[PDB]
């Protein structure tokens, strides 16, 4: 069967993919491009309206001396210019982040204990349902106790709500199903049983605050907003005095003792509060992505959906905007979710492993790392050598390094069933690549790469951590493109091969199994394509409160 990237290469270029020569400088620069043409015209209009020059194709160097390529969004039949995958231009990408940023998980276990002990009242599915009706009025920003309150417009905050889940089926079934994330409905049988056993009789809220608020404010707003309206709803639904000593236990429980943030806060040089991208560990990112519960018979698909999720969030939005900005890092990320390239390399590796070892049956050791990561690295590099069109497509060494090493690392973890040896395979891939082509990435690409082998199995204070627990604030990882989303993939890989329901936090996994989200986390790449086509409908807009 053809290599999975061949269709995309034939779409991009007139030459066959194997052809070594082409002709440049005859395409009219930017004029070859529908999108650049749109931008030139828009810049003229913007500048004329506001009285300050803006986009101008004649500033600096002339884009488009070569072909300005379309990209296939991998697993789709959608081909778009890369500008349509810039997070600024792609409402699906923006909404993916808003849906994470505006979510927190908040237990009801301490809260219900406070109710039964301290207030001496009973909790049943019926009282929980009444509480949930109440908090779904209050959470978007509406009142339940005071006179003369002024409130948020319901239609501006239609995306905000609260659901619950529990591992106890009989309890779940007694709560009004409008409010319940039904684990048995959303997960295949074996995964559902794993997840229900993790949760047990615990009861957890999934709280989503309004996108318009999240965009006005920041991620650290989420758990506070959540807690205020949980607090008001506990007062109203359980008939408390409206501000007594017990009220503070609900606040402490909802804000601290049983809250799970999506991201933890960051140190001062990169100061941020909770629920910002740098605080989201790789294992959580894999669990937020919902490919695992749909595509479970295909561990490559699951792993590469996680890579797409993470490459976009971590490289485009986080490193490319929060930590830098400007034109940013679209194609550093698109390399990992376009043209079915990473897919080709990773299916090669999975098949190699299946045949030699069987998934998850290789020894978890350095022999396996050396074997698998080397073989897969050489396959990927050979494709760039065999197909000049492929090399011209993934033109930046960093892009190639990330893609080849992601395939090598995922494949290694498919073999061992362990993310840490997967990680070792990622670094070996870099080292081999660097020697093969006498180049790797950009100036600063392999800071973590060169520290990498030694820090995989270290146990020291700021060095040692299982990969699932690492994230964008792991010291070596804190700066550079072309790694973080790929690491989320490697984190997913052994778990997908094992058939595990989750990678690092079962509550996070369940919390995104929800079709009331705006973004469809089951099909991240499909959503990116929809956004690229300007077909995605985000929350948070102000149309209702602005002129027609």
């Amino acid at each position: 069967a053809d290599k999975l990237f061949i269709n995309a290469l034939k779409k991009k270029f007139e030459e066959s993919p194997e052809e070594k020569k082409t002709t440049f400088y005859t395409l009219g620069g930017w004029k070859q491009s529908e999108r650049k043409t749109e931008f030139v015209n828009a810049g003229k209009e913007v500048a004329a309206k506001r009285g300050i020059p803006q986009y101008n194709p004649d500033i600096g160097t002339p884009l488009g001396q070569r072909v300005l390529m379309p990209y296939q969004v991998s697993t789709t039949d959608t081909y778009v210019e890369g500008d349509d995958l810039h997070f600024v231009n792609n409402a699906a990408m923006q909404q993916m982040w808003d849906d994470i940023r505006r979510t927190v998980i908040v237990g009801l276990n301490h809260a219900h204990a406070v109710i039964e002990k301290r207030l001496g009242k009973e909790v049943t599915p019926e009282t929980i349902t009444h509480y949930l009706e109440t908090v779904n009025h209050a959470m978007p920003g509406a009142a339940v106790v005071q006179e003369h309150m002024v409130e948020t417009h319901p239609a501006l905050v239609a995306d905000s709500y609260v659901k619950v889940f529990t591992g106890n089926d009989e309890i779940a079934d007694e709560i009004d199903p409008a409010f319940v994330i039904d684990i048995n409905k959303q997960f295949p049988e074996d995964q559902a049983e794993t997840l229900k056993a993790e949760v047990g009789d615990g009861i957890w809220q999934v709280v989503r605050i309004p996108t318009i608020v999240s965009r006005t404010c920041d991620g650290a707003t989420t758990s506070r907003w959540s807690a205020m309206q949980i607090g008001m709803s506990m007062i109203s639904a359980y008939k408390q005095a409206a501000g007594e000593a017990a009220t503070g236990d609900f606040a402490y429980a909802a804000k601290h003792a049983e809250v799970i943030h999506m991201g933890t806060y960051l140190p001062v040089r990169r100061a941020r509060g909770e629920n910002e991208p740098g605080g989201v560990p790789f294992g959580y990112l894999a669990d937020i992505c919902q490919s695992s519960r749909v595509n479970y018979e295909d561990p490559v698909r699951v792993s590469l959906d996680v890579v797409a999720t993470g490459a976009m969030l971590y490289d485009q939005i986080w490193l490319g905007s929060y930590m830098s900005g400007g034109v940013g890092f679209t194609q550093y990320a698109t390399a990992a979710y376009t043209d079915n390239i990473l897919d080709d390399f990773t299916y090669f590796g999975k098949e190699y492993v299946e045949d030699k070892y069987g998934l998850c049956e290789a020894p978890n050791n350095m022999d396996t790392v050396l074997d698998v990561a080397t073989e897969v690295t050489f396959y990927g590099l050979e494709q760039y050598e065999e197909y000049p069109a492929l090399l011209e497509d993934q033109f930046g060494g960093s892009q190639r390094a990330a893609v080849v090493a992601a395939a090598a690392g995922c494949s290694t973890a498919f073999a061992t069933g362990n993310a840490q040896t997967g990680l070792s395979g990622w670094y070996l891939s870099m080292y081999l690549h660097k020697e093969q082509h006498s180049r790797l990435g950009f100036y600063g690409y392999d800071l973590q790469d060169q520290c990498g082998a030694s820090n995989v199995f270290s146990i020291r204070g700021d060095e040692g951590l299982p990969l699932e627990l690492r994230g964008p604030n792991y010291p070596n990882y804190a700066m550079n493109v072309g790694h973080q989303g790929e690491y989320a993939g490697i984190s997913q890989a052994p778990h997908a091969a094992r058939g595990d329901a989750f990678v690092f936090n079962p509550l996070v996994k369940i919390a995104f199994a929800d079709d009331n989200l705006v973004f469809d986390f089951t099909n991240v790449r499909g959503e990116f394509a929809k956004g690229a086509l300007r077909e995605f409908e985000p929350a948070g807009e102000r149309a209702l409160i602005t002129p027609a």
């Binding site: 236990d249 001062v268 069933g417 146990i459 700021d462 951590l465 094992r498």
Partner: protein
């Protein structure tokens, strides 16, 4: 001595120990027992060996509800605790027979660790205690069971948690009374970021000892912050003495006189009477059926008023055996005494202000919690410069079981380890003995 003042020192039963001790014998800068307490708090760590073992066995590492399927390791840590602790001790110590302590508790389920003082002498701060302890136990466990290169990172996660992806040791199975330096509200705040429940736990709910430990920590922080330098030093020392060390038996005697039937108001009346009797205040002038009091020694008035504030908390929250009303006592003792006298309240309004926000943030939806989760570094309760939090410690010591977030709930690991240390558990004893010992060198 810089100051002329002398105080009489009493024990936690209200009995005289030593008369006419120079005030500065109680100073954090001079008193060797306060130095030993502070250095002990810097260097002490509680290790939960049971917790480490269970995290490993279940692969539940890295924070609440987290788990890595397939990473489980079944290691008999508690059954080999003696060997593991000895091996850890060899790495933690600097020299044989130095002041390193590693003691097993609970049948090997817990260890008390005191990292040698010499490591802190050449350290900037206090994080060597958890970091040296953590790596010594990670290495000792790896070495005990010959844990492989491939698996050892799970031991690290079980001991210290999600650090360094998280800033904190998120999910760790070690504990300290101090918290990380990044969480300080301001430079110099570290001895303030010690939960009230931890203080109550360490002192086994002995009311006067909890008040003393809290006051020692708070007023020692006031020196580190520079607040107790120059013009303010005597105020802070007198506050330590009279509010936290029961100087002149004033707190004890006010409680004795008001405990049977008294209220916050009756304690105020007694304190004003005592201040007048001792010449601390005097009538400055007469309005219509109202005496305006003045003072020639504001720091001493403040200290007397602070003793009365402590006594008022003990009487009000001791009568209720319920801590919540400490926020009210801290407010209205101060509000009432100003309109009773025409003199400023404790800390010139800052206890009252702290109490307003503390009341709000312990009876509302917005933040805070019960009294025991506050501390001098908490945004709600940082504002008074040592004169509020010790009363909260006294109140929580007197709580008979009204709190969900009790010391039993928040501070059990801390209790088991830190209450073993005599100077932490009974600081009033040791600080008074040390003051008496150095009285003729001040």
């Amino acid at each position: 001595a810089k100051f002329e003042d002398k105080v009489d020192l009493y024990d936690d039963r209200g009995n005289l120990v030593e008369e006419q001790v120079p005030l500065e014998a109680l100073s954090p800068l001079r008193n060797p027992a306060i130095k030993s307490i502070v250095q002990g708090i810097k260097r002490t760590v509680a290790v939960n060996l049971e917790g480490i073992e269970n995290a490993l066995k279940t692969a539940k590492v890295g924070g609440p509800a987290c788990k890595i399927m397939g990473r489980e390791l079944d290691l008999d840590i508690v059954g080999n605790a003696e060997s593991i602790a000895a091996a850890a001790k060899e790495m933690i110590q600097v020299t044989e027979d130095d002041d390193t302590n590693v003691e097993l508790l609970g049948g090997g389920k817990r260890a008390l660790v005191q990292v040698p003082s010499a490591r802190f002498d050449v350290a900037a701060e206090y994080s060597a205690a958890p970091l040296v302890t953590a790596t010594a136990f990670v290495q000792a466990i790896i070495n005990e069971f010959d844990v492989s290169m491939y698996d050892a990172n799970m031991v690290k996660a079980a001991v210290l948690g999600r650090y360094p992806q998280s800033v904190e040791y998120m999910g760790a199975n070690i504990a300290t009374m101090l918290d990380i330096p990044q969480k300080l509200e301001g430079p110099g705040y570290a001895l303030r970021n010690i939960m009230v429940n931890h203080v109550v736990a360490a002192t086994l709910k002995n009311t006067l000892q909890a008040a003393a430990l809290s006051t020692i920590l708070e007023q020692t922080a006031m020196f580190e912050m520079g607040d107790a330098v120059g013009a303010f030093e005597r105020m802070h020392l007198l506050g330590l003495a009279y509010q936290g060390m029961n100087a002149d038996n004033l707190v004890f005697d006010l409680v004795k006189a008001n405990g049977k039937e008294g209220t916050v108001g009756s304690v105020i009346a007694d304190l004003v009477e005592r201040a007048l009797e001792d010449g601390v205040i005097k009538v400055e002038k007469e309005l219509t059926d109202y005496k305006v009091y003045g003072t020639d020694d504001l720091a001493m008035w403040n200290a007397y008023a602070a003793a009365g504030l402590m006594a008022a908390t003990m009487v009000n929250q001791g009568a209720a055996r319920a801590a919540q009303g400490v926020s009210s006592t801290l407010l209205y003792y101060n509000d009432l005494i100003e309109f009773e006298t025409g003199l400023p309240s404790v800390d010139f309004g800052k206890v009252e202000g702290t109490a307003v926000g503390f009341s709000f943030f312990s009876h509302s939806i917005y933040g805070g919690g019960g009294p025991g989760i506050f501390n001098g570094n908490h945004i709600v309760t940082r504002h008074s410069k040592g004169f509020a939090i010790p009363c909260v410690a006294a109140a929580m010591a007197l709580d008979a079981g009204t709190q969900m977030f009790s010391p039993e709930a928040t501070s059990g690991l801390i209790k088991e380890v830190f209450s073993q240390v005599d100077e932490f558990r009974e600081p009033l004893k040791y600080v008074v003995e040390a003051a008496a010992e150095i009285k003729n060198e001040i």
